[PDB]
Design a protein around this ligand. Structure first.
Ligand SMILES: [Cl-]
Ligand SMILES: [Cl-]
Lengths: 405, 405
């Protein structure tokens, strides 16, 4: 796989595909983490004298966080202290001309790539390379630098389509994401502890089964909805309020799979011994075995309890390898972030080689200044696909582009 | 619903949404029938001194007939004799500026609307009006003239999204289409004869069931795959190559539905009494009352027979209302077009109020010059939807727009 050092970018037009798809509120970006994660690659191309054309998606059609890339352009302008021109087009006449007018060291960003109908579809490289998006942009670019690890599990045209048409190179972020995850995945050491939270139940279950069956994990700790589903699968009654919540998310269509995984690896999976509910706005912790458990029928679980975090810490502090994804509870709400903060701090204090991902789901981490984690991935869905043992389309394309040029 | 005369388009900017989605061969237009169908509307707008911005889709993403609208610009230029400019954008910066620069009486065409990720989705008007396509285009246009009858059954942003934002008006084609079809459908006169051919079995069966159950048709004649399905459902076998061909496109999944319809309206459904088959490229007509009927277990049917045509026209001549859709056989093949050519002429001669539709499926009719048919619709799926008694999103949007402005 090509690396940034293998090419001379002076006066070369570079299509830099990154993932600046950021969490938003009222259409405003609420976390610039993904922007900071790509500054090194961007700075390298600028200093290298390349003409940088940035491309990113934001949300998906009809979604609340589906916006133009105008704000991304300003955010980028500020972090780089260099004007980043917002080109309101993707691959049409205007975009091509604006791209041609770029001088060495200058940077611009195209419109939300997902404004394009071809871009939103996941298709084989053979189909992506024939898209109008790829064919028309290919006429004005020399190389493609892909730093979009967070979208590495998608097979969309801007991501894999240029592979056989232009040399597609890994950015610095992509290279460090792959190196860290591969390192954790293939460790020969142990304990290898996995911590799965968040609401991506189906995908988290694919991870659980893969790492346990292939022995990449010695133990799996659970939080968030992942924990709720496994806890129900064990036989505990989480209450109507909570059962309906899971049901309303189709998450019950996975309780089945959860039970089957429990039947096969019961002793290698840990679930909360206590939870926190939203009792009239206040944080109230109940014990799964205590009587107050009745509270679960009317009040919703929002976080794991003090004793679970405590137990998880003990285990994590003795791990050699830690792979974590997603929050332990409703991380965005201060009163229900404790569980996540404690588990993440345990990961950070642990001497283990640690990797923590979650994408937008763990964006709130930027408020707790947690240090010590070896690698905080920009990936959420992408990370889950990787630890599930699924080939990432972007990585395959990178390999195909390398073997070709 | 508004009409072109309810407004003064002098120096007004009008977004003329038409359906110029044309049949193609290797990316080039092989039929301009849909272009001619909208000329009357374009001429009028020009004469009114309006700033005409044409919008059309072509194919769908990743399809073989998905192309830019640049050739459409040429074709349109010739037919109008007035050079139409191809604007390579939809609603972006370049698009808005090009539109602004239009003089009264000038015509331009935007890029294939389905290059837009928002445009390809069928969504409620409430969501369509909040799209970037509608929001951004609404700032540079005064009126929307919708002549896209062929796309009337779709609820995509360009078609229904402007409804509440700008007065949407029926062009001359949309109006002519709605009335002609509304006439036949509600006609209290008789005999009302329907002729259903083509390969859209599911959609055709919905029409049969609706018009017979709602007594809008006194008799139904069948051709193409629709005839096979019904004939086969009557218990008359059609060989192995054919039967397998049925399974090929899963047409045998509708035989059951065809049977239910037969068990309820058997006397009102006419199937062919003789077909024609292909043999290395040789038309061979067979009769159900005749002897030799074998190749069927290794070869495929491609048209009805002479006897069926005679009978069909015999009936068609006694009709007061005729609604036909699709070909009788493989219309694109010179040899296997006889059945179709014959039936269409019968419809033309009949003194009944006739309506023929099919869209791309009957494009070959441009090589036989058949006059007499009262109304040759540009619609195919749109026509079938209408006669199935389904509500057309574009008509409902045209009304909503009316009872607003
Ligand atoms: Cl996605
Ligand atoms: Cl369609």
């Amino acid at each position: 796989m090509f690396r940034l050092e293998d090419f001379n970018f002076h006066n070369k037009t570079v299509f830099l595909r990154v993932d600046l798809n950021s969490p938003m509120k009222d259409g405003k970006i609420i976390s610039d983490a993904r922007f900071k994660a790509v500054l090194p690659t961007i700075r390298y191309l600028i200093e290298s004298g390349a003409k940088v054309v940035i491309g990113t998606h934001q949300g998906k059609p009809y979604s609340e966080d589906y916006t133009t890339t105008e704000e991304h352009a300003r955010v980028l302008s500020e972090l780089l202290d260099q004007h980043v021109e917002y080109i309101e087009d993707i691959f049409g006449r205007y975009a091509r001309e604006k791209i041609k007018e770029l001088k060495s060291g200058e940077v611009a960003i195209l419109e939300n790539l997902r404004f394009s109908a071809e871009e939103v579809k996941n298709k084989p490289i053979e189909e992506c390379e024939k898209t109008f998006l790829v064919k028309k942009l290919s006429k004005v670019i020399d190389y493609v630098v892909n730093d979009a690890f967070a979208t590495a599990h998608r097979s969309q045209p801007s991501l894999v389509g240029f592979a056989r048409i232009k040399p597609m190179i890994m950015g610095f972020l992509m290279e460090k994401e792959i190196e860290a995850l591969m390192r954790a995945y293939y460790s020969k050491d142990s304990p290898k502890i996995y911590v799965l939270g968040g609401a991506k139940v189906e995908d988290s279950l694919k991870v659980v089964e893969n790492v346990l069956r292939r022995e990449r994990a010695d133990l799996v700790l659970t939080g968030g909805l992942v924990a709720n589903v496994f806890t129900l699968a064990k036989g505990f009654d989480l209450g109507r309020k909570n059962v309906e919540f899971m049901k309303k998310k189709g998450l019950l269509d996975y309780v089945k799979h959860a039970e089957e995984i429990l039947d096969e690896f019961y002793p290698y999976i840990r679930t909360p011994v206590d939870f926190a509910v939203d009792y009239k706005g206040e944080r109230v912790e109940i014990d799964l075995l205590s009587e107050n458990r009745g509270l679960l029928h009317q009040y919703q679980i929002m976080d794991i309890g003090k004793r679970t975090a405590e137990k998880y810490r003990e285990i994590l502090m003795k791990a050699r390898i830690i792979v974590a994804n997603g929050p332990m509870g409703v991380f965005e709400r201060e009163e229900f972030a404790i569980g996540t903060v404690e588990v993440f701090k345990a990961i950070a204090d642990s001497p283990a080689f640690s990797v923590l991902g979650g994408g937008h789901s763990i964006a709130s981490i930027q408020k707790y200044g947690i240090t010590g984690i070896t690698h905080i991935s920009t990936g959420g869905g992408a990370m889950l696909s990787f630890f599930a043992g699924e080939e990432l389309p972007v990585l395959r394309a990178l390999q195909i582009s390398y073997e070709k040029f």
